[PDB]
Amino acid sequence: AARRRDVDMVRILVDYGTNVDTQNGEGQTPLHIAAAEGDEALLKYFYGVRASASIADNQDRTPMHLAAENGHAHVIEILADKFKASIFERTKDGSTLMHIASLNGHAECATMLFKKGVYLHMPNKDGARSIHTAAAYGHTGIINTLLQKGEKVDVTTNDNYTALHIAVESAKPAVVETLLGFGADVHVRGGKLRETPLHIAARVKDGDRCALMLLKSGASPNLTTDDCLTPVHVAARHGNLATLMQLLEDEGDPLYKSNTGETPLHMACRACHPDIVRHLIETVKEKHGPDKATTYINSVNEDGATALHYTCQITKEEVKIPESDKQIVRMLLENGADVTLQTKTALETAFHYCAVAGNNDVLMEMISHMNPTDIQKAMNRQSSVGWTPLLIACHRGHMELVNNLLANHARVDVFDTEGRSALHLAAERGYLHVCDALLTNKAFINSKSRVGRTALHLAAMNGFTHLVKFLIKDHNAVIDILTLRKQTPLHLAAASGQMEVCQLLLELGANIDATDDLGQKPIHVAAQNNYSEVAKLFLQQHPSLVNATSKDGNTCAHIAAMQGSVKVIEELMKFDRSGVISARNKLTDATPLQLAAEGGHADVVKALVRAGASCTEENKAGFTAVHLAAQNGHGQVL
Amino acid sequence: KDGSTLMHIASLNGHAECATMLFKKGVYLHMPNKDGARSIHTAAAYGHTGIINTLLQKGEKVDVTTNDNYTALHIAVESAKPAVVETLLGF
DSSP, rough: OTTEEEEEHHHHHHHTTTTTTTTOOOOOTTTTTHHHHHHHHHHHHHTTTTOOOOOOOOOOOOOHHHHHHHSSSSSHHHHHHHTTOTTOOSSSSOOOOOHHHHHOOOOHHHHHHSSSOOSSOOOOOSSHHHHHHHHHHHHHTHHHHHHHHHHOOTTTTTTTOSSSSHHHHHOOOOHHHHHHHHHHTTOOSSSOOOOOTTTHTTTSTTTTGGGGHHSSSSSOTOOTTTTSHHHHHHHHTOOOHHHHHHHHHHTTTTTOOTTTSOOOHHHHTTTHHHHHHHHHHHHHHHHHHHHHHHHHTTTTOGGOHHHHHHHHOSSSSSSTTHHHHHHHHHHHHHTTTSSSOOOOSSSSOHHHHHHHGGGGGGGHHHTTTTTTSHHHHHHTOOSSSSOOOHHHHHHHHHHHHHHHHHHHTOOOOOOTTTTOOHHHHHHHHOOOHHHHHHHHHHHHSSSOOOOOOOOOHHEEEETTTTHHHHHHHHOOOOOSSSTOOOOOOOOOHHHHHHHHHHHHHHOOOOOTTTTOOOOOOHHHOOOOOOOHHHHHHHHSSSSSOOOOOOSSSHHHHHHHHTOOOOOHHHHHHHHHHHHHHOOOOTOOOOOOOHHHHHHOOHHHHHHHHOOOOTOOOOOOSSSOOHHHHHHTTTTTTT | OOOTTTTTHHHHOOOOHHHHHHHHSSSOOOOSSSSSHHHHHHHHHHHHHHHHHHHHOOOOOOOOOOOOOOOSSSHHHHOOOOOHHHHHOOO
């Protein structure tokens, strides 16, 4: 009867003794359904029975609060006749139900809720007052009555936003008209970015209805942000077309220059918007001539960046419009370009950025159409590192792009400052079909770097067994290639300690005990970087009987004593403990306990003393290992 | 396209009896021009003292500036209207 606004059934049912403060599953009271219903008949009937109204719903919508959720005023005054507290609205965010009257927008509720709910001004937990939410949800009459009651529209929040700086965020046009009529200053400031409202008007998606009303009352497209950028730059960023047309119509210059040297063409192009770039070149072509349009396209930001550099850095994931990047490149190349434009610091042209990104599934074609032969002059140049886009694309693994560059016949014999080819980069990152695409294009396997590393050395270093099978099996790469440090990739593979790779190299077979520049049999290099399972491969398979190995310095167990390799010497002692205790170095007469105590590794002492290893083995100088503990200062070994 | 806002038109021609009924009806005090000039700036520009008496009566501080920072003296002296500047000093 309350929600149906039935007064006869409330008089008879309440005359039958019903609950005056009844509660449904939602918790909204029947008197709260009378104030929320906007029916003063059931409000005076429940007020005649003195119905308590403090028990609101689950959303705390009390009789004045749910009556303001409807918009009734006599239900709020009759709620005050039922002693509703008009000074009590809080909902852990500063409810303060003039905000609710600014949520829904009821002026007849706002006047009686001004005489009754006397609070002008109590802000939200964000810091927003009633004009901020009235301007947010777009209720002009509430702004007429709150501005009539007296509150300056230069009011800010905790985040410094004025009423324009919230009404333009919601893009409510006639609200902004009333705020300009109230006396708002269109320049003023923004929160945490220190921004004019045009920087909001060129950022919100619906700004075109509102930004002209910022320019009807006059505003400043010359006004920069904290990062020194016009709102032309902002509409260049956020993809707003008609707003940018209004900004250029209002004598906003497209010729400004950011703190990073960026024109709005640059950051317009980086956000990938075709009609903005189109429109900017169509305006600069008129108001400065096509020559200054060509120098405007070839305008140079900080670190030598032109707009062609900001073409290529977009990707195929963040493109989100199918043929946008291609026609942006058509609008930039077709209207004059400096297609190389070698950058200032990092020496690389905009072509290199194609190989950085992967939108050169399309953009490599589009740039690669409008040059007859100097494409090769673009492809044969090197970066500051010394990189060609073959080195960058093969460094990343954009496979179809590598198929595009090799069909466009770039030279595979380029070299970086580290003496590396594309086989060394793609083999370093481990891509199969990139190296396959190189070797179809007559790449040279067994090339070497400054360290003399081959592609097999890097693939064995970085764990790519399919690339190792691909090189040795598919392309007959030599297995026992030495570095400049005279290292085969079995112990350069055991240097990084990759077990299955060394299983593959021993499955293909090579000279195991081939010494390195330090005379290093492979388990020495396995013991320097203390990979226990790799020594378990070279020793569990046991192809060379290298437990009693010899190097230029010492044996493997001595290096195991040097590193503190209790797992590695646990495997070595667990295989050949009797032959691992008696390790006397032929050059120094040293034992592994002496290098353990000299290194101060107490756990190696626990392992070898746990296996035997009497301490009384004197050196060539003559010491027990206790004396090396005394010389080196390791009391745990003591 | 330049912020017409016909209280400016009442400040162009200078009719106070049109300004009162155009204040109750054309309720906008304050919407500036595309240059940034409000109704006191054009009333002071074209030299109509009674419009400045009624707009100053309706409430608007004469330290108001434009987009180009000119106060009401900084436009009334550009037009060199003397008694306008007298009323602005009285304001």
